[PDB]
Amino acid sequence: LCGIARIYEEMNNMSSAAEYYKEVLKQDNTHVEAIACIGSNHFYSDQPEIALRFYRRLLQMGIYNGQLFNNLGLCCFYAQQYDMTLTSFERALSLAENEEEAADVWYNLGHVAVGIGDTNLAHQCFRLALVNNNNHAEAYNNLAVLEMRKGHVEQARALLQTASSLAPHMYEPHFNFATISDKIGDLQRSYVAAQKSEAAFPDHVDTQHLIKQLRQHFAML
Amino acid sequence: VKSMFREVLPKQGPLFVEDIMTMVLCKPKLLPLKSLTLEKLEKMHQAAQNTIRQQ
Amino acid sequence: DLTYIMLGKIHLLEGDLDKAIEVYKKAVEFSPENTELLTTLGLLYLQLGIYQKAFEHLGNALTYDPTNYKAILAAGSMMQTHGDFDVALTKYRVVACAVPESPPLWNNIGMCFFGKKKYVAAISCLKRANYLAPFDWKILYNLGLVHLTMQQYASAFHFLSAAINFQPKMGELYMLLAVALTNLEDIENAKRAYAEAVHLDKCNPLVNLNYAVLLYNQGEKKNALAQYQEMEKKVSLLKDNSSLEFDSEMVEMAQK
């Protein structure tokens, strides 16, 4: 029953995957690798309180990793439980195995820091994630939205330029290139930018309001 | 005469009137929990470096 | 037609909208059938303060094209400023199967449930926007306002103070953040936060001077009526000062 719900997540058939993971939890109520994969698929799609209940229980089995004090830190913040939200991160900064691993805990701390509104704090959270690990493609994009809030256009447009070349998937630098390079006016690079923000993620809304914004300019006036 | 405690809230909010094309961020990620084979195979391979560090 | 809106781009960028309307009033004259020229005219009337003409122009754009997403939110905002919350969602449900993730959309439906007193529904609907757009002026101030109605005072300090950092010059954020403090115990911070509140507006709102008497109700007696008579006359506003006047009846009762 775990092997059948593992190929459904390969095709992203979560309509019929997460029912089987409700059976490996029906009997066998302590299987560890079907507790996270329900407690993660509730943190996304707006059940950040139920997803905490699957992670405080997984603490009480007594595994005590560094990866779990990250996930326990994120669920308490988005469920608005401000006590355990940040002590769980300081224990996650400690007891981290590799130097590439303490980057990701600094990076998730950045999304906390955007949530309180402090950008000066947030600017040095992605930076420390970046000096502890380069080629962290999700932070290069994320640092240079904070740059464009200040005004450093040419600084921002080079970080998205190198966030894309590290992740040749993951539509978010590609679309974000084509709202910097569109406001300037370069409608040729801002097409190939918003070309890959369609092939790497179709059914986006604000790509289809941008290619048709450009293809009216390309035909005639 | 016990207390007033009347702090009248505005009961209204700043409704949007149009969408604005803006820039959006990468979303926060939950780290995976490694399996008990991956915990064993990393621990064995980590000790494989120290036995070749001396030989 | 395309020569018009670039000319309309000029007067909005440099300044006021009053000369910019007559650019569009010429533009609707030449082509009364184009929906894109009408909808931008509708938002321009609404920023002036509506004289019911903006309700007419959007319906012309809605009949000529019923699925234009920018047209719906304007009439979605236009109905919602008076009432018609059940009517508003019926307009919003047309477009929610087309733009399933829009943060200006999901803020409004969250604010529409706030009218019908489905309080626990709105926070589950507003927080779908704050995940999707992490910093906004408006999503954060809405998300903090529903908590003070629900008396969840400790969480409302987190969102109200998270929108001071993104635009400091607001008055009413400073007004509500002080009310988020007095249910906690930072009375030293409460007088300091109120000190920046009364200064940053200087003309428009009258609610925060009614807040001045409630802080002054505890251990103070002199400047109560001084704050109460401060800007008592309203120049031109349709805001609900009458519900505050029930509270201001208790304010003048303290000094009589």
Next chain:
Amino acid sequence: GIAEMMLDENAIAQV
């Protein structure tokens, strides 16, 4: 817990 293809995130794609 958070992957669809070549380690991509979620809740801005779908689900």
Next chain:
Amino acid sequence: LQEYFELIDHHFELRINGEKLEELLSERAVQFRAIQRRLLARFKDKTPAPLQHLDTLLDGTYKQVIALADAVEENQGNLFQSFTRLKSATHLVILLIALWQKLSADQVAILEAAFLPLQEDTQELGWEETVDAAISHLLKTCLSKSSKEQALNLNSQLN
């Protein structure tokens, strides 16, 4: 500068022949990896895989990947041996322009890096792709009246 233009061409043609002996080995290495994958799909200890079609065809495509492997280094070694010719030429040119009109040693300093990428294997680095790109933006804010690189700007994009 006319005699300088002869040496930049036959070096670049040797780079073109350097760009000609490389693609023939790659597809034959693609042929060499395909024949290994044909072996490992077949090589097992039973009947339907013959020991023939497994040994002698391997050697001919093994002779393919070595008969040019000793030849791709001869031009590339001569490419490096001609790169010293190319630098000693472009050092000699850049000395004369410093004195053809008198230059204040900062104008030659910009030219000391504009013509001089000290490279070894410039097939991915583009020495020829650098020297036109350098003098492209160099046309603004260095000095006026110098027409030799302005004539060389014509020979730049015209190879």
Next chain:
Amino acid sequence: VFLEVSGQFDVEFRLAAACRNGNIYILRRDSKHPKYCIELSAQPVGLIRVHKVLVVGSTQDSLHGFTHKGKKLWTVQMPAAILTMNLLEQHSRGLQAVMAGLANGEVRIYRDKALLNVIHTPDAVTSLCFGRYGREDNTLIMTTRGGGLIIKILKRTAVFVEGGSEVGPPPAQAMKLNVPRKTRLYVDQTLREREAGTAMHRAFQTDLYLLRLRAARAYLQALESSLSPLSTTAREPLKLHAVVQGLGPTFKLTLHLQNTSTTRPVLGLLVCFLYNEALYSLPRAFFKVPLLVPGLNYPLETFVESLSNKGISDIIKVLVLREGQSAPLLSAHVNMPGS
């Protein structure tokens, strides 16, 4: 390329013609010059007149209409690409309609502003006439894009109506207010926040107050060492990677420099990588970087030659020319363990 005539002679003569420049030109009876000119936004795909109004077809699928002198009257949008336009003329009924052979295969029929009918059956139609064929008086011949034929025949009983229903905006119940459901596990959490919440606020600040200190004490620990791949004075970033051909004992390391100025070419810097001596060589080890133009990215490649199986991180620096040894943009590259 497209022209027509109203048709009168010796008292008045209107000759209209469309051109390759996307204009409408009309001619008087004897004045041999274009007296009145009106324009469109794109190429007209067909020029057909009605009894007094004259319609065009734009390739942006906006079928206009212009009067005798020529002004804007009405405009019908079409939901597919226009491909053929023609004139409908019934001798019996006296009906003057305009055809529109669309791209998906339908053939829409229009009067002034009304859709009359459609024929959905065939593929894309390129050719179209409507007249009498042989003995029958009502024939509307069309033609497939592949080359085949399809013939329609009108009957005497059928007269053309609107006959159009009221197609509304959203009659489907596809999404009836998609809002997630909040269970009991949230409604007990608000009671914990309501009474004991005042302890929760002071718990957040004094834990966040250590967080600002712990960040800045670790930020300045690397900024003075200049570990960050970003700079401000000399304005390039530095990205670097292990390439696919870098596997085994041999190993290849690329490096990416690119200026972020618009007009300020940085000049003749130095790249050197100090590294703890493992058993690899890297024979050059100290370059002189070329003149970085503003805008292009530069690949810079090396050749690690490891002899046995280890793994230890390199640090690659870039310096200013002679004076400042402070080494901006030093990137502590973490190596892969090769065999």
